[PDB]
Amino acid sequence: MNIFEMLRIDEGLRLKIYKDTEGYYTIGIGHLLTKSPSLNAAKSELDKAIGRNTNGVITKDEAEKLFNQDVDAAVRGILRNAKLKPVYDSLDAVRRAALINMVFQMGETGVAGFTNSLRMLQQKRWDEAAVNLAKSRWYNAQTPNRAKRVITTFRTGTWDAYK
Numbered sequence: 001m002n003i004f005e006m007l008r009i010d011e012g013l014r015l016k017i018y019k020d021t022e023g024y025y026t027i028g029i030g031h032l033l034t035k036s037p038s039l040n041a042a043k044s045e046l047d048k049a050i051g052r053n054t055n056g057v058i059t060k061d062e063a064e065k066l067f068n069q070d071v072d073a074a075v076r077g078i079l080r081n082a083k084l085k086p087v088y089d090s091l092d093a094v095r096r097a098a099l100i101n102m103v104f105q106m107g108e109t110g111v112a113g114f115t116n117s118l119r120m121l122q123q124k125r126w127d128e129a130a131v132n133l134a135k136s137r138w139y140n141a142q143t144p145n146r147a148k149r150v151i152t153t154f155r156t157g158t159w160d161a162y163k
Contacts, residue, residue: 001159001162001163002097003071003097003100003101004067004071005162006097006101006159006162007029007030007067007071007101007104008029008067009162010030010101010105010146010149010150011029011030012029012030013028013029013060013063014027014063015027015028015057015058015059015060015063016056016057017033017039017042017043017046017056017057020032021143022142025039025041025042025045027046027058027063027066028058028062028063028064028066028067029063029064029066029067029070030070030104030105031049031063031066031067031070033045033046033049039056042056043055043056046058049066050066070104071100071104074100074103074104074108075100075103077103077107077108078099078103078108080108081108081112083112083115083118084099084103084108084111084112084118086122087099087118087121087122090121090122090124091121092157094153094157094158094159095121095153095154095157097153098150098153098154099111099121099154101150101153102150105143105146106138114132114133114136116132117129117132117133120132121154126154126157127155129154130151130152130154130155133147133151133154134147134151148161149161
């Protein structure tokens with residue numbers, strides 16, 4: 001398992017325009033198109049990303065290129081974040097993969113705001129960190145089950161949540 005399989009697992013794949021948990025236009029493997037209520041806007045945003053007239057639908061390979069780009073930016077976002085980077089440096093390979101999962105899901109900015117948990121990860125207090133992570137809208141309301149998976153990864157440093 002690696003970050004690709006992991007997010008592939010958490011996000012799925014859809015070749016047509018869709019609405020994520022918060023009613024936002026998304027496509028492929030979690031590609032957020034636009035916070036904008038307009039399907040048109042979502043379409044125009046899409047055609048731009050892909051570089052063609054999609055009519056709102058893409059190919060598998062097209063999903064896959066957006067995904068590579070997205071995993072890449074995540075990682076880079078982390079590396080540029082003053083707040084995120086040192087956490088990241090301290091983590092093992094599995095655990096960074098969860099860190100990257102949350103960044104992909106709620107941005108660097110959203111993530112860099114879980115200060116508390118971040119220190120606790122930094123300091124290797126897995127259990128405390130999981131508990132702290134759990135007190136979130138993320139966990140509580142947003143995406144419970146996926147948050148539990150990611151939460152568990154951070155705890156165990158295993159992919160057990162993934163099989």
